[PDB]
Design a protein around this ligand. Structure first.
Ligand SMILES: Cc1c(C(=O)c2c[nH]n(C)c2=O)ccc2nnn(C(C)C)c(=O)c12
Ligand SMILES: Cc1c(C(=O)c2c[nH]n(C)c2=O)ccc2nnn(C(C)C)c(=O)c12
Ligand SMILES: [Co+2]
Ligand SMILES: [Co+2]
Lengths: 385, 385
């Protein structure tokens, strides 16, 4: 049941902004590791004396990497005379964010029909303001409200990347592509799920998205057409193995974005490409499930995936779960940086054709149980041996 | 003339430590871009609750990348009970360094016979102390004194990487190698050369190394066998084109390390490998000199390099200079990070065989003149056209 109760018109995920210490090195590492091309920049070479911002793209996926210059470079400036291309940026906030959380997501940006109205309605409905609506070059409006922790939800709307950004010279823009195409969902970790859900659903009108002992409780908020999907987790205390949600909050110094799920148009090719680069500057993946997990795949997805595709899932370490409507293939990277906080999910969904409906196949909640049972069977198999 | 006046026994460059915001992403980028393998780590997985440190190696070259965790993780600790593997590390200092300078070199480390005596003698001779001698696991002694700006000169001595570091698992250690073999020299930029030279030569006993209108004055300090080479630059003001040394001081917020020169055993192969990766996560190089520069190469190094090697220098953008004792091949990267501050030089020296004597061929000072004349001739050639 989707009551379609959005309080403003939301279109789709627009971009994700990382706040970095050095945006150059993070962006180059992500570009090689994820197969995203350098598409736009705003830095000293474009007249920005305030921050360095580099944009990577793959299909519709946009990752923005931003870091501050020395404040001394823009000492003469005031907000009305700023050279920053993102006027919500603030040296002090950026340094405090990164000092407090390390590398991670500052902004989850969604495209809306009218960012000014989205901001007004949001705050009228309980959102905590972060940056007021600002119109850039009479062409794009940006506004920001607090989402959770130090993460903001950013509204962007276009009259017809951003003004002040320059498209990147083809020589520096190598056309990497490993198959990633868009942001599927963006997941937050919070100390208390209930108040976080009430707050965000409160000011967006986003509804609970229906789903279907291991560290978390979660719920998913969704836009009208369910193409903007915002899951939120809380830890469950008093277990035997410590909650990874609690571990996150400790190392992140509080709530923040936990993982970004990136849709691939061919998850086999994405994972082959990413795995070739894991030890030469790219991203590492979580340890693969045991062969028992994959033997168990025939009995639950044998009608969707052939035996060859199931064994290709096994070679690549890919997980599979299924809804009543569709099938999901997924895998998780190790943490993106020094701290055991943010990671990335690669995902591809099968089914729910009408275009594919958002969230088709769920989010893989069933894989917590299947991973447990598969690890237990595998140990018993070898113990027997 | 080398008066061999070192005040303690200095062996060779040991390592260079970068202070980072996220050590994971900088280290992976450098590894791919320079062809250095992951060799050792000290982080949460080794019991270090204070900092993440990752060591890359190529031949004898050691790059250490370090970033702080949340101070909350080590709140219970005191220096006598620390889990840090580098006891001079300090959260506040590291955050201030990076906030002030961005990505750059915190420590130039040299191996000495006795780090405690090197520290005592240094301070007795004017060095400003930074971290007192500390003996690690009864096996290695580390001490630090101020060099210039927020850069320290670090002494390391071994009884027989560092205690508390673990060697890295072969799977995560891909044996990259593009030919780089050791640190040749490490160059500082300061506002006033005279007092910097007096200070450092004062407490080391290092002597001036003999050399042979464009932005700088420089001088080179050297150890007894001239294998530790520490050039220092100051800007020259009142020129037409602004001094790149002054630009550095402005964007770096004061003095600091300007470039690291990395010796290659085959600079042609290094530059081919590095240039293939420039647009896929590696390092970019300065714009190549015009063809006139390379036509002029025959008249000054035609006796050292064949016409094929000279045209291979041209394909790769390599510079050539020569002393009265040896020949030098060199090239410069664009800045390593967001700010126009630190960069890297790749170098290979021809001559002075006895082993090769340090500094053989100089540092390429003659290339400032040759680059000017070559750019002038090339423009006149095309202007004529
Ligand atoms: C992150 C994750 C998801 C996931 O992505 C979501 C779960 N709920 N929602 C809304 C989601 O987006 C699904 C199954 C998983 N199974 N095992 N693991 C281990 C490596 C610890 C997971 O991390 C894991
Ligand atoms: C850095 C550099 C050196 C160098 O490495 C040293 C010069 N003196 N000492 C002690 C050194 O180590 C030599 C010649 C150069 N010619 N042109 N350029 C332009 C790209 C701006 C240089 O940057 C350049
Ligand atoms: Co997910
Ligand atoms: Co040099």
């Amino acid at each position: 049941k989707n009551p379609k109760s959005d309080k403003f018109k939301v279109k789709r995920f627009h971009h994700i902004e990382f706040w970095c210490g050095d945006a150059t090195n993070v962006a180059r590492r992500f570009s090689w590791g994820l197969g995203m091309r350098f598409s736009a920049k705003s830095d000293l070479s474009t007249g920005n004396m305030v921050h360095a911002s580099y944009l990577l793209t793959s299909g519709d996926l946009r990752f923005l990497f931003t870091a501050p210059y020395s404040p001394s470079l823009s000492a003469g400036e005031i907000k009305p005379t700023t050279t920053a291309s993102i006027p919500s940026f603030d040296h002090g906030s950026c340094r405090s964010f990164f000092s407090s959380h390390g590398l991670g997501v500052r902004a989850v940006a969604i495209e809306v029909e009218d960012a000014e109205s989205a901001f007004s309605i949001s705050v009228a409905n309980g959102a905590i303001p972060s940056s007021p609506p600002i119109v850039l070059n009479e062409a794009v409006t940006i506004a920001e409200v607090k989402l959770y922790g130090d993460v903001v939800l950013r509204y962007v709307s276009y009259k017809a990347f951003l003004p002040g950004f320059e498209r990147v010279e083809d020589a520096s823009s190598f056309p990497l592509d490993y198959g990633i195409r868009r942001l599927d969902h963006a997941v937050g970790n919070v100390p208390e799920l209930g108040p976080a859900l009430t707050y965000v659903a409160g000011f967006t009108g986003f509804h609970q998205f229906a789903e279907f002992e291991s560290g978390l409780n979660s719920a998913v908020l969704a836009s009208n057409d369910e193409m903007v999907l915002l899951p939120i987790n809380e830890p469950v205390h008093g277990t035997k193995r410590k909650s990874q949600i609690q571990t996150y909050l400790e190392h992140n110094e509080g709530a923040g974005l936990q993982h970004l799920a990136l849709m691939s148009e061919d998850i086999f090719r994405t994972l082959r490409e990413m795995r070739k680069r894991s030890s030469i500057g790219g991203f590492d993946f979580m340890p693969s499930p045991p062969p028992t997990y994959y033997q168990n795949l025939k009995k639950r997805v044998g009608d969707v995936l052939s035996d060859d595709q199931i064994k290709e899932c096994e070679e690549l370490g890919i997980l599979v779960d299924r809804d009543d409507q569709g099938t999901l293939l997924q895998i998780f990277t190790k943490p993106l940086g020094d701290r055991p906080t943010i990671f990335i999910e690669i995902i591809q969904r099968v089914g729910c054709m009408m275009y594919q409906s958002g969230g088709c196949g769920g989010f893989g909640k069933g894989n917590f149980s299947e991973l447990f049972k598969s690890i237990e069977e595998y140990e018993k198999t070898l113990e027997a041996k």
